[PDB]
Amino acid sequence: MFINRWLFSTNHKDIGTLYLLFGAWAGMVGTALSLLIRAELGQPGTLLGDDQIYNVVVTAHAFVMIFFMVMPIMIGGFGNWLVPLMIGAPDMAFPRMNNMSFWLLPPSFLLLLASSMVEAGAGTGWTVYPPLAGNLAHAGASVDLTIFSLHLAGVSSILGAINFITTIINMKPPAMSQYQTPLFVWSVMITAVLLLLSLPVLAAGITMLLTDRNLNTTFFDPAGGGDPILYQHLFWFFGHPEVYILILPGFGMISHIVTYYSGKKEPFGYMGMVWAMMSIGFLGFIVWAHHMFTVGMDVDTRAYFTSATMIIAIPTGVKVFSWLATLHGGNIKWSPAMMWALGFIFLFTVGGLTGIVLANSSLDIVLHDTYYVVAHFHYVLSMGAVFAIMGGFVHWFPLFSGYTLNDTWAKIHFAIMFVGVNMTFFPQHFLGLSGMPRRYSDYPDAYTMWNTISSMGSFISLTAVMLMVFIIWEAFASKREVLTVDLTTTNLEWLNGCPPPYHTFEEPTYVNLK
């Protein structure tokens, strides 16, 4: 029973559950790594003694948070659970391939951990640039284990994107057009299209790195006529789309949360929201060299990429505005999920504004590779992606489990986390304006005060993560079973009860053409 159900699954809900369990455990690993980064920096001097170990910890923190925590939970977890329930589909198009997307992730994670166990680990930064990543500065197997880790995660996501796109286009009620599907579904479809286009380019680039390292190719090695800068083009060609892939399903969840707890039956400006997501998806393919404003490209190239990058604010502010307009006239229910969402809307805006500042290749000369970049992206990842994840998790938890959380505990959890992240990342703006580099295990003495504060903030977010664990336990410990859910007439995923049964829509929904 157990093996058939849990190792041989063909069920979109149970596979979504596995992804949630996987990402939450990866979350713990990524968090402990971030605490180690902040411990090394929380006073002057060296704590690890070993600056290769520091770089290994920074690199692993990033891969774990992006590939094993954020993308499994948002796409694999929420996407599997919610997308068929939102369009009335009996499962995913390819329910057995879907299980391989999930099972590719523990072996991929195992390879990343193995790379930090053997030799001196991969202390390269998550961009893994040659020659630092090459077979002389990083001799031995660590960087090769890392590259293979990324191969298996890229294949898992590419097969997942093909599943989601096929499901969303092919398995709706015959009368429902694409313009009648919920915003979260659009957000996942568009994310799947970015994954499908950008992951194979990543795969081509790290393959060429692997051969430079092991087969005497010289794609990236000036001695054979190669060029380390070609690697950066290939990597960022994937890596920009990758940031938009991390945020877009959170945009989809935020729309549902803010609509729901405003008591509204639809988000304001549904076609503007869909337009804005497609526009961001499109523009996110033509801006990547803003990650390269110091490598020595022509001035015109840099002027174009500054300009193209700024355009992205326009569709983005359309969403920000449409969230606010959705709130407008609401009957506001101050639930914990709505608090996460309101925090998303504000902090994500701050983080997006610092991204605009960095979009100027002029000013970026002085901010590149400083802590101002680290501030920008932790605003949009650790207060955008992660707040959307927490909001989605408290909102839909009763659907997934059949039990309710203690809302008071959940609100305390939000308050502590909110204090923690702001105290950790806000002072990093000062550090980067004042010229402190990224990727440093120690700093000149003048930078002490901000670093001290930032490390203290990080322990406050630790307290919050521990509490969240306790909150989930308390809910399964107490077993308050769900009775009634509001607003089901515009939230189809709740209409089968909590939790829904194993097979839902065996008889599909009935929708008239009219």
């Binding site: 630092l132 060029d227 549904y270 020595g296 359309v318 100027n360 004042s434 010229g435 000149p444 005060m449």
Partner: protein, 227 residues
């Protein structure tokens, strides 16, 4: 250099860094305007018992909120790009100097007339003289003439590094097999500090850059004595 509890940029030492300060002030004023406006609108949406939960019309209001950000972007881009091109403008330098990154130290080459080159390492903390700056000081500083246009050429002999001096508005990556150019002009004499700005291994945090900017006559005597 940065000083304790600094909030913003190092004082400009070069005209270009000064241009960046004023452009940054203009951009940050916009940023403050937008984020405060967003915060104000949120608190406004959340402080009334009045409700209106039936359908709203989107297409009308959507113009304001597309045209406005668009005018604002143009307001940032014009001056941004003017500065961009200025950093690129035909300059005619008086001196060329090469810097080569290595793991983990910089070497410098002044080969316009003689073959002057030398290595510049961090001073270890246990060897600092009282009043010297932990992690910042080198044994051999980069002596240059003040008030002159200098062409720096940057490259590396091993992995990537990046040569930066915040006060002057400079950062150029050091890529083996490639020669990147930037130009340096200091308005003032003195000592200006920077730090490797592209992760290069174990001692990335420990290969700093110190410029010593002095009158030409002193630069010439220094160069001769360094052969």
């Amino acid at each position: 250099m940065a000083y304790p509890m600094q909030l913003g940029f190092q004082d400009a030492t070069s005209p270009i860094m000064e241009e960046l300060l004023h452009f940054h002030d203009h951009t940050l004023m916009i940023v403050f305007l937008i984020s405060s406006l967003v915060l104000y609108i949120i608190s406004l949406m959340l402080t009334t018992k009045l409700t209106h939960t039936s359908t709203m019309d989107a297409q009308e209001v959507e113009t304001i909120w597309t045209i406005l950000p668009a005018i604002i972007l143009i307001l940032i881009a014009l001056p941004s790009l003017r500065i961009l091109y200025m950093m690129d403008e035909i300059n005619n330098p008086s001196l060329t100097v090469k810097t080569m990154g290595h793991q983990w130290y910089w070497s410098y080459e002044y080969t316009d007339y003689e073959d002057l080159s030398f290595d510049s390492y961090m001073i270890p903390t246990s060897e600092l003289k009282p009043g010297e700056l932990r992690l910042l000081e080198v044994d051999n500083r980069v002596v240059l003439p003040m008030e002159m246009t200098i062409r720096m050429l940057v490259s590396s002999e091993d992995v990537l590094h990046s040569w930066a001096v915040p006060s002057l508005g400079l950062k150029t990556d050091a890529i083996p097999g490639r020669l990147n150019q930037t130009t340096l002009m200091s308005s003032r004499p003195g000592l200006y500090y920077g730090q490797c700005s592209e992760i290069c291994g174990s001692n990335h945090s420990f290969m700093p850059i110190v410029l010593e900017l002095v009158p030409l006559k002193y630069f010439e005597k220094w160069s001769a004595s360094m052969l």
